Paper text:
[name] is a member of a “paired receptor” family as in addition to this inhibitory receptor there is one very closely related gene with activating potential in humans and several in mice (Akkaya and Barclay, 2010; Wright et al., 2003). We report X-ray crystallography structures for the inhibitory [name], the activating receptor CD200RLa, and a complex between [name] and [name].
The coordinates of [name] were used as a MR search model for the [name]/[name] complex and [name] was built in a map calculated using partial MR phases. The structure of [name] was solved in complex with [name] and contains an NH2-terminal Ig V-like domain followed by a smaller C2-like domain. The interaction interface also shows charge complementarity with acidic patches on [name] complementing basic patches on [name] where a network of polar interactions is clustered. In addition to a disulfide bond between beta strands B and F in both IgSF domains of [name], there is an exposed disulfide bond between beta strands F and G in the V-like domain.
Residue numbers in the entry:
A (entry chain B): 2 to 203
B (entry chain A): 15 to 205
The structure:
Amino acid sequence: VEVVTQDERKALHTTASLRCSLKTSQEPLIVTWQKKKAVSPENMVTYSKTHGVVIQPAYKDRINVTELGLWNSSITFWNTTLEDEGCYMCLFNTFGSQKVSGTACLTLYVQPIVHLHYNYFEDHLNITCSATARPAPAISWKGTGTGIENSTESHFHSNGTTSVTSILRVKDPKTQVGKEVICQVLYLGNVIDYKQSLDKGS
Amino acid sequence: PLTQVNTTVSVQIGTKALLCCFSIPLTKAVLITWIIKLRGLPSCTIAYKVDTKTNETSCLGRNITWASTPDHSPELQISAVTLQHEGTYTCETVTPEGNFEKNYDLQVLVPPEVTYFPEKNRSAVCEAMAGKPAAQISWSPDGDCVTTSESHSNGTVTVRSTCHWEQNNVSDVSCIVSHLTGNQSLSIELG
Ligand SMILES: *[C@@H]1O[C@H](CO)[C@@H](O)[C@H](O)[C@H]1NC(C)=O
Ligand SMILES: *[C@@H]1O[C@H](CO)[C@@H](O)[C@H](O)[C@H]1NC(C)=O
Ligand SMILES: *[C@@H]1O[C@H](CO)[C@@H](O)[C@H](O)[C@H]1NC(C)=O
Ligand SMILES: *[C@@H]1O[C@H](CO)[C@@H](O)[C@H](O)[C@H]1NC(C)=O
Ligand SMILES: *[C@@H]1O[C@H](CO)[C@@H](O)[C@H](O)[C@H]1NC(C)=O
Ligand SMILES: *[C@@H]1O[C@H](CO)[C@@H](O)[C@H](O)[C@H]1NC(C)=O
Ligand SMILES: *[C@@H]1O[C@H](CO)[C@@H](O)[C@H](O)[C@H]1NC(C)=O
Ligand SMILES: *[C@@H]1O[C@H](CO)[C@@H](O)[C@H](O)[C@H]1NC(C)=O
Ligand SMILES: *[C@@H]1O[C@H](CO)[C@@H](O)[C@H](O)[C@H]1NC(C)=O
Ligand SMILES: *[C@@H]1O[C@H](CO)[C@@H](O)[C@H](O)[C@H]1NC(C)=O
Ligand SMILES: *[C@@H]1O[C@H](CO)[C@@H](O)[C@H](O)[C@H]1NC(C)=O
């Protein structure tokens, strides 16, 4: 492999950096960063020893070059936007022998916000379990009771965030549910269990 | 905000070809590289470093020309294009303003050797020998025809058509040969 690059999954409205490491003897002349588009790629910035850093008017106050060098280059979005999400290429231009690309793709996330409403009445209980994240999170019930009444609804925001709300209506904590009622929420392959118990006495 | 241009160029065999870089002032440019990938040969480069006016070439054996002038980008030239010239040519210009590209798919065209003549029992023959791409043979008016295509190793194709018309009120026919290098209609007088 010629160019070493890692895709980056970082948080929305915060700093994100892409890096390419060119592995070869031949010193390049100029490095170009482009945003992969349908139609032609878009020119973002170049670094050269002869001309230094040159950012296109479009990206003027949105990125800088964090690593100045012909072998190792990094670009940094100061504060990301959904627009900034996508695929990028670092081009190493060397005299006398074509060029070499490195594609690195950027994906932005929003950490989940979870609401847990528990509501207890005559013997029976209803739990609603809401979760808003980006990408959409996965709600599931681990304090199973096989039967029960239960419905899940989702909403997509103009934000880009996705809300999922699961309403579970227990009728009696006997054979209905164990000693813990679990709302388990998966977010990009990561499950966190939200556990709810109940201690009486005698 | 154009940064890339893909183009298919068709050239008659034996005729001139001229390939142009992305259109940018030579004082502006930093590095200009032509990348040639010919049928059955590896990738290949002619490079020009603007500031020091130096060049380097992996491209020997491809039989093409690199035309240079002061204060203009270099261009590729081929006086008389051959079959082995078929392939991919790409000028890669880079300026401080970023990377630019002009890709070319060069396809060589061979005009078919066309022969035509009348025949025994009100028949006719019409042939377009080793053209590229294959030509198409029609007739006017429609007769009892059999038309066949043979492919040659050098990517040329021969198309042969023979027709009969039974005895009535038709005595003149037309072989119509369609091809990119130009269509033609040939007349025949039936035996
Ligand atoms: C990023 O920019 C947004 C405006 O779109 C602003 O609301 C937010 O506070 C900024 N955050 C940081 C960490 O710079
Ligand atoms: C980022 O680049 C701009 C040029 O658009 C320059 O004004 C600024 O000094 C740079 N900032 C940093 C932190 O390097
Ligand atoms: C490029 O990156 C490597 C590690 O990724 C770093 O150690 C090195 O300093 C850089 N190369 C050069 C020639 O500076
Ligand atoms: C809880 O339960 C009652 C039925 O017992 C139902 O009518 C009500 O809509 C539920 N409340 C919520 C907030 O889901
Ligand atoms: C959710 O509802 C379905 C039927 O609509 C049922 O099969 C399932 O058991 C319920 N989930 C739980 C945890 O009881
Ligand atoms: C995103 O903004 C919408 C308003 O469009 C809001 O309802 C939603 O809850 C927000 N989510 C976050 C995590 O800010
Ligand atoms: C030729 O044209 C398209 C659109 O300009 C471009 O995306 C593509 O990369 C080119 N095709 C190839 C095979 O390089
Ligand atoms: C190109 O390079 C060759 C060999 O290195 C040199 O002799 C020649 O002067 C150069 N010519 C041009 C036009 O750049
Ligand atoms: C180039 O020309 C030489 C004659 O010197 C010929 O042998 C060779 O086949 C040609 N190569 C191509 C790719 O046309
Ligand atoms: C291509 O092959 C056919 C059949 O051998 C021949 O007639 C034609 O002239 C060949 N060569 C070229 C250079 O077109
Ligand atoms: C040949 O005929 C086709 C239709 O069969 C027509 O579109 C085209 O104009 C003709 N070719 C030339 C070179 O005139």
